[PDB]
From TrEMBL, chains A, B, C, D:
Gene Ontology molecular function terms on file: glutamate dehydrogenase (NADP+) activity; nucleotide binding
Organism for this UniProt entry: Aspergillus terreus
Residues where substrate binds: 78, 99, 102, 153, 386
Family membership: Belongs to the Glu/Leu/Phe/Val dehydrogenases family.
Active site location: 114
Domain Glutamate/phenylalanine/leucine/valine/L-tryptophan dehydrogenase C-terminal: 190-457
GO biological process, one term: glutamate biosynthetic process
Designated name of the protein: Glutamate dehydrogenase
Binding site for NADPH: 82, 84, 122, 154, 156, 193, 197, 229, 231-232, 253, 279, 284, 346
Quaternary context: Homohexamer.
Gene that produces this protein: gdhA
Catalytic reaction annotation: L-glutamate + NADP(+) + H2O = 2-oxoglutarate + NH4(+) + NADPH + H(+)
Length: 460, 460, 460, 460
């Protein structure tokens, strides 16, 4: 009621999720799951603590540290820690709510949570960050553990911070266990850490194509437009290049890079690994603009994004940050001819893009339509590997890169089929119309979580 | 000298084990596993706690809750919880002592325990059961854990109740871990786990039959008389039909329903799934008889047992409850060819109907003799999957129904091979005589546990 | 300003405290205690959890439950729980921050903390409250203890509720210890615990007359007007009568109660126990004012406060709720001849009323000026005794009513001496002007706490 | 119901409690206290566990250990450990139930509990007992604590064993804390502890029926019958000389020690210390009856009891073995003028003797019925000083004999006043008549406990 304060980014996330249930037959054939709706919307535990850390030059500095522990029906709480100046409880509760159902769809026993702080890594030495991670871990220590809550990273996967965190836990608790995810190979790491959300997203589009076009086309000779030039985007280019598709695009913070002749060219691995190499030393495509290998068949577009500027390309993978896509760019990926999109980043496409594509699929059918596949289905591939790493640490063994990838594949194929089938179950599409992935996926995630909490006595 | 409390169901168990050891050449190799007897028969710990809860009409209801943790040399304590008005520490110690050696024979690392309450589910709503399970788990919390004691379901405690239990533990201890067995698939559950006991009897009998045949016969064209129409019995009525035998009966708490022609007539899976579907409403077998499908192929028996009414049958699968075999009905099948009777019903027979089969085994030479099989061999199938589920929750994964069955096979074939081959060593049969299974099996499980307890310094 | 949630009631609390420091020479002697200001203003640890419980009709209910653990430099976290529909992090932080300095001034080793939920006792039966308290301690248990957080009662939470809390603690943790305060006498109770709130107020005020007038006036023949008829107000209506003054009036929220002759008349214990008697069956004052025993010597004033309708009164003791004196009535009290006011209840006088008194204190000298002493000076009656009860439970003894009151007295005597002298230490008034107790008390509470926090290495 | 096993001496304990309550006006004012009646029958937690230990000839032992934790509303569970061959859960439940209410009456914060083993120290060397106590306090450590359950010594457990128990705890838990009672002074021992159990019983009689006499019978000038010459019985004589009485009798094993002059000489302290001296080496009294100091002032009859031979006594103290009163030894007492029987030992009176005394109590006036002093008023002194000793160890200090006696006095005055007042409160006597004190006592302990457990929501 009235006392319930402002957390806007959560409130709209709740409505959009409730809306999927309301715009379906689930709630028509389960009016007890309404009694569940309100229970889960409140997180099972939230913690907030003061984080004090001495800086370089030796001065006392105070920030706020957090960990939202949203749901635990499926498994131990699973999530990520995000260090950004704009962090409050509102954004992480939002992120925590999404995490619940994403972990549901992986099929691994994992709960939902999110945390971190309002610390800005920019203008901080790795030595100041060290003492911060120590001091963060010090007062989260008691609310986490391997069977209870296993945090991770968010805004960009580097294990540098995960390194500092796990060290302080071991020094406190006298224990070596999977308390954190995204660990280095030497100290309890997964191989296929770097290719979790990137390689995984392409597989879904592979799974997309075959069902959707009923197997007369595949990634073979399809041009794919990616945003971002980072961890997600390079490894998400490469699986397309593996399947004899083509990488049309690349993008960064001071401009985009597109191939000039939009039908018959791409970014080769060799071309990608240079921008991989540049981005580790904090370079752009302003540092790559003259190159003999790049200049002759490419075009830098400064200050701009790769949706509208690409002329004709048939997949979209926004893999930089959230809200890179706006309404302006959204329908541009309808007039360009693309029938396939998932957000390789977290919430990369706006609510306008979201509203746009599902709204098209609502009232247009067959081959004509673009299919926006949800983050909780496509972008699930990071957090599954994280679970498979927790599973590795539990087993106390390390897996072959192929064995981890083999399972990653199977998780995404079932995740797609679950959303697909759950859509047809409840939001039965009209003949010609593709099933709803935002609906299938949300209902598929909500029913697993809901049904579990019925049999765990959290609602009755 | 007789200072202890009178415990009539445990004393029944005690003779069975001791007598088998005495009627064997154990002590002709090993007289120090004699003194073992007194150490293990005393439990490591017994818990008993008052449970207070509320009924639907808002009143106080006060009940007694229990947990015997008998032995743990081989692994964490493992055991079901049973809610029945006649339960006390006498019965739980009894059931607990049997559990020890059954888990031994699986080869998994599992101890022996048993618990539950004297609460009667009958009359009580699923809503009242909820608040009771909460209040039961609330005290038990402190005496259990995934490496210490992992309980399960039993008479009147099902996955619905195991749901309620697991939820309260997680809410108390702030962890997601395999504290219970028989969990739902989505929250740490095993496939085959509800349907393991019934595969357990059949597979055991097949290899039991084979050593009888000395490698020549199977359920192929064998008529089987099954009692019980619950979890064990239906899937054991199916599983014989899977290998090519025939089901000439099934039964419940009212009485039995059987085919006309007990030489070459049978049920079908479709007819079994009819009983399966209907019994989950607690609805009777008398109700099946007047359908189109039943009346003209069958006869219901108003208030009978189905041993005396099947005629020429050699196979008996008593998969209802304890004391569902009596001497009268046993002899009725001895002239009809009863050469096989394994027990999934943990204790389908008592002191009278133990004896007669062992006495038959020592005369009617070869396969002409009866092989009455131990509870610690056949019904072990269910409790194996419990261990494989603990193994899955350790690994933090789920295995496919097939993969779990594949391993379950090995446990049952090795269990028989252990008892059979140990019997030949100690209860050496005369040529013409089948080896002694209630000897082999009891000696097999008891010696491993005694041997471990010597190495763990619990006896010297 | 901008990454912070907006929490008004806390900002005012922090402002008034920062303001007192700014209007003072603390920072002039010690400019490192700015670093001290900012660290403690962020709480060390805050907890928020979902509270699920059941209503009369067996309906599921959801609330949000909290416990802010603000500071613990002085001792274990101490502070009440509040059950009110309005409850949110703004109010709990606010109440939590203030608690820190009040505990400082008691001298006892107690930190600051506050918690509770958005449970409304109104329209809940003792039976629903019971089942709520069952489900509340359940998720707080892990964050508290006698040597960590020791909560108490507050708006909506009484010893009856603290009863239900303490029962679940014993049930979940096999521990019986002083985890909560305001317990019944037989099960870890203090004497004067039911009496403290009223008695404590008077003692503090008693010193004020004596210092100010330098022992030339006392409670003999001074009119003291009480608002409220609560626990707090009755023992302050008795304690003035004990010391030889006269009780002008009593009140609640359907109208005040006054004597006919407001210059010489009082209440009597017999007439107080009637109002005590009515409040236990939740009967108001309007309901009693008809009596032959009452109506002949009093006049009921419906719907109105007793501050402007006293006219001639010399001491004023807010003993009801928050903001139960407004500026109008505060200035009105100045014109009537009231010279002393201190909040026996929580947060009685407005900051405007205070500042109206603060303006008067600055411009009048000797006895002549009105002295508002904030709540953290007089209301420590109930919070000091809480510590003395924890001390009793630690010693595992009971002290006599007299012995506990004797100490309670001395704690208020030292609290007055601290605030008085700390005012003169930093904020020396111009000679003849009375010392500032908003300044003395806040500086006295801040500096001791900061000094602890400095030497415990949490600021430097 | 039907499952309850046969549990005798607890039914007798429960009967005597329930019956007393049901024969009173408690239930005229308290109708909900039937809901209370059913809760307290069932203990909150009981653990019953295997002890293995080792003997001097290298032989393995199995012996059985118990610890009933009956109720803890008032304080931590309190109750001694007893090593007696006849121990089962029947006797420990019985002793446990009584202990609850005995602690209640003292007003110290103590729950009820009881434990120990069926091990007989007789025949065992202090070396075998040592290794047994080690092995006992290997497996009970986890179910006790100073804040959880505080055991003590009893039949077969002495300070030697208390040392051994506490020593093993310290090796496990790395803690020095008051787990146990009757410890040496230097390592947590209280300075009236051996001289508390006796002094307390006499004090009660000093006022017990004296309030009837309207404070006219100082514990001077009373003729006494003492049955026992042990710790409790000896020290019940040392205080008597202080108060101005004269003791005629005592008793041991083979025979009795009763005076020639039944109306004349008491024992001297030096004469008592003579009996005390031989009881360290278990040397009997027959060895001192042949000496000039005692042989010429006493009369020994081997194989008789000390009830009637005196001829004339005004008190009876069955403080020897478990039961040393018969039908024939139970009416002459009435004819001699003994009106103040004061049960020293547990179950000291026979139910037939009692039922002569119950008949006498009903047929009389107020100061010269044979007022039987209950199970839980007289020996309360023994367990009371335990609650000062754990309190001393908590405070980390040792108190002088005077200070411990000073409190012992106040405990006994309130204990008497509770029984006294609770009798008159509920079992209001007819004018002239003495009340029932076993009814005062039974109602007094049960109402306090019920009151706590009502407030803690364990019954409603």
């Amino acid at each position: 009621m009235s006392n319930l304060p402002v957390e806007p980014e959560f409130e709209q996330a709740y409505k959009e999720l409730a809306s999927t249930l309301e715009n379906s037959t689930l709630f028509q054939k389960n009016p007890e799951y309404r009694k569940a709706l309100a229970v889960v919307s409140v997180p099972e535990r939230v913690i907030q603590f003061r984080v004090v850390w001495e800086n370089d030059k030796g001065e006392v500095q105070v920030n706020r540290g957090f960990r939202v522990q949203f749901n635990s029906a499926l498994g131990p709480y699973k999530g990520g820690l995000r260090f950004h100046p704009s962090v409050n409880l509102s954004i992480l509760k939002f992120l925590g709510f999404e995490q619940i159902f994403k972990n549901a769809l992986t099929g691994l026993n994992m709960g939902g949570g999110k945390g971190g702080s309002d610390f800005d890594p920019k203008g901080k030495s790795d030595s100041e960050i060290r003492r911060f991670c120590v001091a963060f871990m010090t007062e989260l220590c008691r609310h986490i553990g391997a069977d209870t809550d296993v945090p991770a990273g968010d805004i960009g996967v580097t294990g540098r911070e995960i390194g500092y965190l796990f060290g302080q836990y071991r020094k406190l608790r006298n224990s070596w266990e999977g308390v954190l995810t995204g660990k280095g190979g030497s100290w309890g790491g997964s191989l296929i850490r770097p290719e979790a959300t990137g390689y995984g997203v392409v597989y879904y589009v592979e799974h997309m194509i075959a069902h959707a076009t009923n197997g007369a086309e595949s990634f073979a000779g399809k041009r794919v437009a990616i945003s971002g030039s980072g961890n997600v985007a390079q490894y998400a280019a490469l699986k397309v290049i593996e399947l004899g598709g083509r990488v049309v695009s690349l993008s960064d913070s001071q401009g985009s890079l597109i191939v000039k002749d939009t039908a018959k060219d791409s970014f080769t691995p060799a071309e990608i690994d240079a921008i991989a190499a540049l981005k580790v030393d904090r370079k752009q495509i302003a540092e790559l603009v003259t190159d003999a290998a790049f200049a002759d068949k490419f075009t830098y577009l400064p200050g701009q994004r790769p949706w509208v500027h690409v002329g004709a390309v048939d997949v979209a993978l926004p893999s930089a940050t959230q809200n890179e896509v706006s309404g302006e760019e959204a329908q541009a990926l309808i007039a360009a001819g693309c029938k396939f999109i998932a957000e390789g980043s977290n919430m990369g496409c706006t609510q306008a893009a979201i509203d746009a594509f599902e709204a098209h699929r609502e009232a247009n059918k067959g081959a004509a339509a673009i299919w926006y596949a949800p983050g909780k289905a496509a972008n699930a591939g990071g957090v599954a590997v994280s679970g498979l790493e927790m599973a590795q640490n539990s087993a106390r063994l390390s897996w072959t890169a192929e064995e981890v990838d083999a399972r990653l594949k199977d998780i995404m194929k079932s995740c797609f089929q679950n959303g697909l089938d759950t859509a047809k179950e409840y939001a039965t599409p009209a003949d010609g119309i593709l099933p709803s992935l935002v609906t299938g996926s949300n209902i598929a995630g909500f029913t697993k979580v809901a049904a579990a909490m019925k049999d765990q006595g959290d609602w009755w």
